[PDB]
Write a protein that binds this ligand. Structure first.
Ligand SMILES: Nc1ncnc2c1ncn2[C@@H]1O[C@H](COP(=O)(O)OP(=O)(O)OP(=O)(O)O)[C@@H](O)[C@H]1O
Ligand SMILES: [Mg+2]
Lengths: 365, 231, 269, 52, 52, 115, 73
């Protein structure tokens, strides 16, 4: 779980998967990966953050933010700043990967973030052109695909027989894993560049962040129309897998009928009903930084929208409605949230329980 | 090649032909050769020809190949797509939209094509039947935008009859596979070319206009639609 | 100049295409609204024709001038598929026959494009009104109609005709001209006098046929606009498709040039 | 019916004042919850900060 | 009178809801002060321990 | 630019200005083809505020007096926040577009509209 | 001469007192008029301020035109 409704509901990440965070400069790439690390402080997944070619004061603001949110004690921070040798910047992702592989090979789970694979590629290009190795497209050496592929194929899930063989019998019945969240910067939305093309083809899925969405107030900036997870529903708990299906249909319908917003009166009633549902589900995806949501808390918001509880809420009040609804359940339904948070299970008693709480909320709050 | 020499007809599946081209570009750069247009290896057409010319029908057996194709930057004029398309005899397109409809095979009958779809190769009967299905499916896609923008009443009697045959044709393009019994909950079917031509020829002529469209869903041959109907 | 400019132009054309797509559907909805307002006026016209008919027949001693020997309708908005031109091309054809025969012609203009066609050619006018709502009311046409009925009574006009497009179908808007002026067993009780009533009924009938004409032309305006916005959307796609080919050429050309420069510098150093 | 309606209205009038006041009662419990969890949060930030 | 019987419930409910919102905002204001006051007290002792 | 570093009032004003200018970047082409009339009233009303905010961002500088010809101006962040908030609220929707060009504080804009 | 793209980094310091006062903000005013013309091409009747600016702009544009070998004091 990353703690984001847009990612955990539509672009789910599983243990041992490799999900690329791709997009232009200054649109939340680092924020999404740091929040994904913060959400693991109680999960059982150890975390690794690798900083390649960053300035030393930026790395210190992320560590200060990991420490302020209580996530630092569960994280290893590997740094190779912009003034350090290109060899150290080229080797840092492999050093961090090696530290993450300890937990996977011994039966446990880990998460690794490579803050800029594009800066590792730039450092490897410097060393190669200075050794006079024959150049290719964008002046990169002939083995730049093999550089990232050799790194990213280590992020994996290993069977119980591999863990019993490695531990020599000590650990048994447990499957270990290493999940990777590599980050890449695109220039003016050009995903056809050499390094982005290589990594998009190596990874299991991609989360695309967009500058136009980020400037339109859609803070998480996830373009759900092109972002994809090839693992899909296998990486989701039972409750979120059941409530994410309609969220997909409502956003798809909104992408198709969004120009009619200025001619909504002239729209046909059925279509006008779909249009407001699409606009209310779109406003639900907006979230704040350093505010990760749990499986139960995400389920309340997704359930409320998917079961129609927002049709009488002005598209401008959907957020205060969500924030107040969670605060109500945290006080009067603490036992039900604790029950959902065990495994993300779903049945007729949980469905009826959530419904009764939302109906009571509307009747007094 | 070994099985072909045995006296067999063989299937060769290549997971991605673009990655074969890229591996050649990488090796060519490592060996220091001067790069060509768009940065590809100077040997691009020869490396593709050396692989593709072994896949043929000989006098002993025949290797047929199914190759997945990737298009860089969605550009069909890029050297890799351009070179590969020169050696392709057929193009099968799988559609996300068709899958939502519920047709699991998911092959797009309008975008998918074959060089063998010629009356001088498959005979006039197979060709007219296939072109008839494509003609009806094209008209229905245009009519659907009319039904959506203006309504179903705006259509003529001939157009509403065509829409009914097009929907029946669209569902009869579905089929239960022996490997999909876990998903479909029904036994698999192997339809012959003879049964395939005969089934579609009848629906175009209107021999099955009285049957419900659902009777033409996931059945195999045309006699099975007639039986699923009696019930 | 390069790939940078073409991306801005493809984005520019893609934005305009999405709104012209909606405007076709908005237009279809408005076309259906104007077609029901067309049908809510037939009863008042078919019954008054029967009364004006029988009342004349039982009262032969009175023969109102309207029963013995141009009003032009135009749009207030653009985007029409040459709907105004096609009628204005039939107005000019009929006017020619009368100029050849030797008669003079006075004109009544309803809508903005009618005025534009006459200010652009210095044409004469006796009455004019525009800015009528997509939902017109018969009361607005009363003033313009009166300037024309009195003419025929004062002999200032020998014949009166209404020039409007007719809604043949969703795809057809037939430009047409028809003459407004000139036009069982038992008998009716008349209060106060038959002559008094015939004078009142004939004005209600001409003002009714004029309202029937305006409303039908509004339905034609909506349909014509639907087709124009469909054409505009299709044309935009063709431009997007052509520009995309030029963008792919610019993309491929930029890569080859850079490689030559890299290879050229490495072959020196 | 005028006196009977005055009684019906008199009951609905007062019951709504008691029911509306209970919204303020939920608000006072919520205000206490905000302040009690703020005291625990402040204690948490105090013990977290002094450890460094 | 049946109008007044719902108008003086509706008006008093809007007043009670405004009071409930005021009670909640007062608690939110009280909460940030309780947290940052503890931060300054903790930082002061940390700096005192360092200086000593 | 973070509510925890500056404040929510400043941040909301900044994001408010950005939202209005981002939406107007797409209506600009729509207005070129077709016309202004074809827009919805909310779009017609937004286009006016965007064009004014763009102009209210202009400030005459003392170092640029040689080029501008006019005197330089200094605006405190308080005036910067106040003016943009008012324009976004629509309080100055009664002023012509030309009044916000090089006018330092919003007050001056109210005076330039009279000249 | 494209007045929007062209610029002098010396500005008013390179002008005589008379031309300096009379030509005040003319380039930035011409740069804004070229923009106003494109926006108001297909719009309905605008305010007096807009019509006045659009009319004043078409006159300085015609004035800046000059023949070759015909300088002015
Ligand atoms: N909910 C949010 N999610 C993400 N970013 C947000 C959100 N709300 C506000 N922001 C702000 O957006 C900016 C995102 O900065 P961030 O460093 O994460 O972007 P980036 O793409 O990784 O930048 P860079 O490419 O330079 O590393 C920050 O100022 C952050 O505080
Ligand atoms: Mg970053």
């Amino acid at each position: 779980q990353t703690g984001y409704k847009s990612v955990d509901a539509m672009i789910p990440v599983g243990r041992g998967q490799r999900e690329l965070i791709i997009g232009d400069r200054q649109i939340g790439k680092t924020a999404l990966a740091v929040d994904a690390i913060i959400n693991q402080k109680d999960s059982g997944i150890k975390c690794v953050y690798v900083a390649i070619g960053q300035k030393q004061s930026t790395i210190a603001n992320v560590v200060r933010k990991l420490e302020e949110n209580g996530a630092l004690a569960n994280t290893i921070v590997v740094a190779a700043s912009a003034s350090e040798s290109a060899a150290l910047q080229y080797l840092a992702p492999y050093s961090g990967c090696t530290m993450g592989e300890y937990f996977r090979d011994r039966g446990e789970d880990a998460l690794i973030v490579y803050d800029d694979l594009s800066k590792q590629a730039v450092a490897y290009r410097q060393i190669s052109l200075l050794l006079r190795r024959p150049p290719g497209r964008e002046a990169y050496p002939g083995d730049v695909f093999y550089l990232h592929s050799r790194l990213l194929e280590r992020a994996s899930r290993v069977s119980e027989e591999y863990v019993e063989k490695f531990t020599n019998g000590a650990v048994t019945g447990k499957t270990g894993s290493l999940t990777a969240l590599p980050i890449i910067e695109t220039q003016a939305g050009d995903v056809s560049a050499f390094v982005p093309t290589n990594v998009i083809s190596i990874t299991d899925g991609q989360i695309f962040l967009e500058s136009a969405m980020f400037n339109s107030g859609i803070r998480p900036a996830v373009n759900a129309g092109i972002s994809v997870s090839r693992v899909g529903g296998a990486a989701q708990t039972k409750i979120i897998k059941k409530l994410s299906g309609g969220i997909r249909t409502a956003l798809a319908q909104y992408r198709e009928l969004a120009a009619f917003a200025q001619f909504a009166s002239d729209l046909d009633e059925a279509t006008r009903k779909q249009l407001e549902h699409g606009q209310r589900v779109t406003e639900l995806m907006k979230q704040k930084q350093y505010a990760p949501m749990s499986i139960a808390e995400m389920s309340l918001s997704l359930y409320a929208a998917e079961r129609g509880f927002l049709q009488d809420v002005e598209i401008a009040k959907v957020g205060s409605f969500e924030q107040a609804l969670i605060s109500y359940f945290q006080r009067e339904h603490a036992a039900l949230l604790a029950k959902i948070n065990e495994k993300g299970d779903f049945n007729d008693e949980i469905d009826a329980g959530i419904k009764a709480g939302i109906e009571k909320f509307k009747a007094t709050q | 090649e070994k099985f072909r020499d045995e006296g067999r007809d063989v299937l060769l599946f290549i997971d991605n032909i673009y990655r074969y081209t890229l591996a050649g570009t990488e090796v060519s750069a490592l060996l220091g050769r001067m790069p060509s247009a768009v940065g590809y290896q100077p040997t691009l057409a020869e490396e593709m020809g050396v692989l593709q010319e072994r896949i043929t029908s000989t006098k002993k057996g025949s290797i047929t190949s199914i190759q997945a194709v990737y298009v860089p930057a969605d550009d069909l004029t890029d050297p890799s797509p351009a070179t590969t398309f020169a050696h392709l005899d057929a193009t099968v397109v799988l559609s996300r939209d068709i899958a939502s409809l519920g047709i699991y095979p998911a092959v797009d009958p309008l975008d998918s094509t074959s060089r063998q779809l010629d009356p001088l190769v498959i005979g006039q009967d197979h060709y007219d039947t296939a072109r008839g299905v494509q003609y009806v499916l094209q008209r229905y896609k245009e009519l659907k935008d009319i039904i959506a923008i203006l309504g179903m009443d705006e259509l003529s009697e001939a157009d509403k009859l065509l829409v009914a045959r097009a929907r029946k044709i669209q569902r009869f393009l579905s089929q239960p596979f022996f490997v999909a019994e876990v998903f479909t909950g029904s036994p698999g079917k192997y339809v012959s070319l003879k049964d395939t031509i005969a089934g579609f020829k009848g629906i175009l002529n209107g021999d099955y206009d009285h049957l419900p469209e659902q009777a033409f869903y996931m059945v195999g041959g045309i006699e099975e639609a007639v039986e699923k109907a009696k019930k | 100049a390069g790939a940078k400019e073409i991306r801005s132009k493809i984005a520019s054309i893609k934005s305009t295409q999405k709104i012209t797509n909606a405007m076709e559907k908005v237009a279809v909805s408005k076309m259906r609204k104007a077609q029901m307002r067309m049908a809510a006026g037939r009863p008042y016209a078919e019954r008054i024709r029967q009364v004006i008919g029988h009342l004349a027949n039982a009262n032969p001693e009175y023969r109102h001038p309207f029963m013995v020997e141009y009003i032009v309708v135009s749009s207030d908005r653009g985007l029409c598929g040459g709907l105004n031109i096609n009628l204005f091309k039939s107005l000019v054809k009929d006017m020619s026959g009368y100029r050849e025969q030797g008669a003079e012609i006075d004109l009544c203009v309803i809508g903005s494009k009618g005025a534009s066609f006459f200010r652009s050619f210095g044409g004469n006018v006796v009455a004019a009104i525009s800015h009528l709502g997509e939902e017109p009311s018969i009361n607005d046409l009363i003033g313009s109609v009166k300037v024309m009925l009195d003419a025929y009574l004062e002999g200032r006009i020998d014949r009166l005709f209404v020039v409007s497009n007719k809604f043949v179908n969703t795809m057809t808007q037939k430009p047409t001209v028809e003459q407004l002026i000139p036009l069982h067993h038992w008998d009716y009780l008349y209060e106060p006098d038959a002559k008094s009533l015939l004078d009142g009924l004939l004005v209600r009938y001409v003002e009714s046929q004029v309202y029937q004409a305006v409303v039908e032309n509004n339905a034609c305006e909506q349909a014509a606009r639907m087709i124009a916005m469909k054409n505009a959307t299709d044309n935009a796609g063709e431009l997007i498709s052509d520009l995309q080919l030029i963008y792919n050429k610019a993309r491929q050309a930029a890569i080859t040039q850079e490689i030559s420069e890299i290879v050229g510098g490495a072959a020196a150093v | 019916d005028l006196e009977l309606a005055h009684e019906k209205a008199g009951q609905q009038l007062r019951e709504a004042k008691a029911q509306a006041a209970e919204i303020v009662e939920q608000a006072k419990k919520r205000a206490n919850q905000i302040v009690d969890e703020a005291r625990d949060q402040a204690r948490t930030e105090g013990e977290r900060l002094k450890a460094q």
